[PDB]
Design a protein around this ligand. Structure first.
Ligand code: HEM
Ligand code: HEM
Ligand code: HEM
Ligand code: HEM
Lengths: 145, 141, 145, 141
């Protein structure tokens, strides 16, 4: 949503982004860094260790899809809260996460990519990615019912 | 909880960093300028360049205190005592702006030391900045 | 999600409620509790003791028209974003306010409503009011950056 | 973190609160399920809600911890470690959640002693609960 000159930039840089372990990691760390989120997943087994939680095939799979899922956001990034509608559904449904943990989680992916990416996750790509989770943190809970 | 291994990745962390810490302050802000724009109102003055000696001598400073702070996890409240009050207090520097500045250095941090930078390096830091912010906010509190 | 109505069928509850005394109440309680509030209200003077930070003619006025502001708003909920886009121009362009704050003066508000009116203030009267806040300075973050 | 016109505060407010303090968590705890739902989750044993006996039984207990909590304002960690990690390491009460009781009970407060509840007592009473509040979160930070 931004310059199309900005959309331009995350569209290109999303894509060099490896989905499988950019959400394993992002799911991964979210895991032992918010230790309380760890609630929503009795869902897999072993988060009572950093080694464990990460690797844990399950919290692995989780991020895979907890991630190009987001990142299928954009295409449209755009219309809507549309998109995401949906998984709102699910999120105030029978989990019931804060709109608060949407925004960590969004903030865990920017530590990810910053350090996978590394000198390119730039205060301007850093910048725009920011928006993006501001956006995707946000539809998911505007969503509430 | 300032907790021992916390303290012992915190300083190990801290430690890989060196004389870069300078570097990271100001990449920090470089940084919260452009990515949590509302902070930028604090920096009236301030030629926020782009990359600008203003930010730079600043960026200088937010890591020299960083750096102390890394090197005496017991006595922060007596340690920050000048600066708890610049900020708190005389600066009056919204708390929702600390959590800001702190994510952007774990970026920063995390951008430069990805070998060394673990969920555990990652958590002990998070937390440390966590232990930063709650001291220099005391006004409040 | 206004329910209809408890919502407005429950603000009914609304006026009767009062101006100068709620706003000046709500704006004065907020200005002594998150002191960083103030940086902003400069315009303004004493704010040197809980005391005349209460006096404040400045503050006092402004408590009014704020309350006045919204409140009114209590008026069509339908399309809140509407109503004060006008004024997320202002929080956002003018002084650059954190969202964060938006909830801070509504939950002051929830409190100063709950002082005012009492028992009159239910579990029921507080959570209906507990959500105008929520759309109102969430309406407020729509837009801004 | 409290100022000592603060401990002050907290005290003829809390010493006005009285033998009412057990109906006081009933009322807050019954104020947030209502007002900020998504917290109801922390409580599957009980029927919750409304005048409920699990709920006067637990506001007791929220209520008690706090008469305790100030009581001895020189030192809440050592009074809460017991507490506040089971909410911090065995329940895993996310911290957000802190600040709704906070309001729940300050708005619970504010309703019973408002000739009483002063721009200068909500202040003190608000600080008091970030702080009961910070130390229940410990476990981490
Ligand atoms: C930051 C706080 C978060 C939390 C604590 C939360 C927790 C949850 C849970 C507790 C479930 C149910 C898993 C199941 O049946 O296994 C889930 C499914 C999920 N979440 Fe989240 N979520 C979070 C944010 C996110 C965001 C931030 C996205 C981004 C688009 C998202 C994407 C999804 C996906 C696609 C699904 C279900 C996958 C499936 O249909 O098979 N999540 N997540
Ligand atoms: C890590 C958190 C932090 C440290 C360790 C840190 C360090 C400082 C330092 C070492 C100085 C000036 C002291 C000097 O010349 O003695 C300072 C001043 C200030 N701090 Fe921070 N700071 C923090 C966070 C923040 C945040 C989040 C903002 C804003 C949004 C903020 C705004 C300022 C400004 C605006 C000044 C002022 C220089 C003048 O106007 O004379 N600080 N801080
Ligand atoms: C919680 C945080 C809030 C803060 C720190 C903040 C700060 C300020 C500032 C500083 C000004 C006017 C400064 C100028 O005119 O030079 C201002 C005006 C305004 N505020 Fe706020 N504001 C707060 C929230 C609110 C909320 C929540 C509402 C809606 C009620 C609002 C309603 C208004 C109204 C109505 C005007 C006047 C401008 C008109 O319609 O002409 N503000 N505010
Ligand atoms: C100031 C705030 C809190 C204090 C002072 C308070 C105090 C307590 C007290 C004392 C207990 C009794 C533990 C026992 O001594 O044997 C308890 C248990 C419980 N606490 Fe709170 N608590 C606070 C807020 C919270 C909040 C925001 C949550 C989560 C939403 C929460 C969730 C829990 C629940 C879930 C238990 C479990 C009950 C049971 O399964 O038999 N508390 N708390």
């Amino acid at each position: 949503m931004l310059t199309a000159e900005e959309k331009a930039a995350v569209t290109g840089f999303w894509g060099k982004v490896d989905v499988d372990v950019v959400g394993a990691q992002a799911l991964g760390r979210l895991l032992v860094v918010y230790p309380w989120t760890q609630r929503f997943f009795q869902h897999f087994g072993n988060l009572s260790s950093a080694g464990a939680v990460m690797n844990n095939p399950k919290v692995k799979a989780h991020g895979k899809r907890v991630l190009d899922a987001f990142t299928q956001g954009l295409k449209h990034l755009d219309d809507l809260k549309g998109a995401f509608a949906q998984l709102s559904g699910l999120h105030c449904n029978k989990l019931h996460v804060n709109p608060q943990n949407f925004r960590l989680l969004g903030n865990v992916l920017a530590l990810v990519v910053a350090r996978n990416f590394g000198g390119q996750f730039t205060p301007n790509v850093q910048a725009l990615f920011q928006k993006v989770v501001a956006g995707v943190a946000n539809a998911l809970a505007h969503k509430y019912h | 909880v300032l907790s021992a291994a916390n303290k012992s990745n915190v300083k190990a962390a801290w430690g890989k960093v060196g004389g870069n810490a300078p570097a990271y302050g100001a990449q920090a802000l470089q940084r919260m300028f452009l990515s949590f724009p509302t902070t930028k109102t604090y920096f009236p003055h301030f030629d926020l360049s782009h990359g600008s000696a203003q930010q730079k001598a600043h960026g200088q400073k937010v890591a020299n205190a960083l750096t102390k702070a890394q090197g005496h996890l017991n006595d922060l409240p007596g340690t920050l005592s000048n600066l708890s009050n610049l900020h708190a207090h005389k600066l009056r520097v919204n708390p929702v702006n600390f959590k800001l500045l702190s994510h952007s250095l774990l970026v920063t941090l995390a951008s430069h030391l990805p070998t060394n930078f673990t969920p555990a390096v990652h958590a002990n830091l998070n937390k440390f900045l966590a232990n930063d912010s709650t001291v220099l906010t005391s006004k409040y509190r």
